[PDB]
Design an enzyme around this catalytic site. Sequence first.
Site, mmCIF file in Angstrom:
data_model
loop_
_atom_site.group_PDB
_atom_site.id
_atom_site.type_symbol
_atom_site.label_atom_id
_atom_site.label_comp_id
_atom_site.label_asym_id
_atom_site.label_seq_id
_atom_site.Cartn_x
_atom_site.Cartn_y
_atom_site.Cartn_z
ATOM 1 C CG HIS A 60 -48.230 8.622 -63.697
ATOM 2 N ND1 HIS A 60 -49.584 8.870 -63.756
ATOM 3 C CD2 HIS A 60 -48.076 7.299 -63.928
ATOM 4 C CE1 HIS A 60 -50.223 7.740 -64.000
ATOM 5 N NE2 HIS A 60 -49.334 6.772 -64.112
ATOM 6 C CG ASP B 133 -50.328 3.066 -64.113
ATOM 7 O OD1 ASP B 133 -50.105 4.212 -64.545
ATOM 8 O OD2 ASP B 133 -51.399 2.468 -64.321
#
Length: 121
Positions: free
Chosen positions: A47, A89
């Site tokens: 991420h 996300d």
Amino acid sequence: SLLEFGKMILEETGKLAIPSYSSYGCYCGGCGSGTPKDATDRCCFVHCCCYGNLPDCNPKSDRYKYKRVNGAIVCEKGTSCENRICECDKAAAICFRQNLNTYSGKYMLYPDFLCKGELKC
């Protein structure tokens, strides 16, 4: 924005972002270095890397729109940055869900000095 990201995480895992993932391992919430401690920490590493692919976007403050198609996360059309932030996300939230079975409390509030390493994106 990280507020939406937090809501996406809660919806996916049933865990609040800010306890559960804000100080987990070496990369969850405030990432710098070392080797990811476990699968969940690896989700955060990837991420952090995903956001890194977007130098001219602002992930923490730019809000995107998304809808749940009963279960599935669908990123809605926005600016180029918003679309890409949303995909980063969405992937993280899914990754967290896929690795809930190995989430370990011993990694919460993990000390910085134990994050020793080099892992390139």
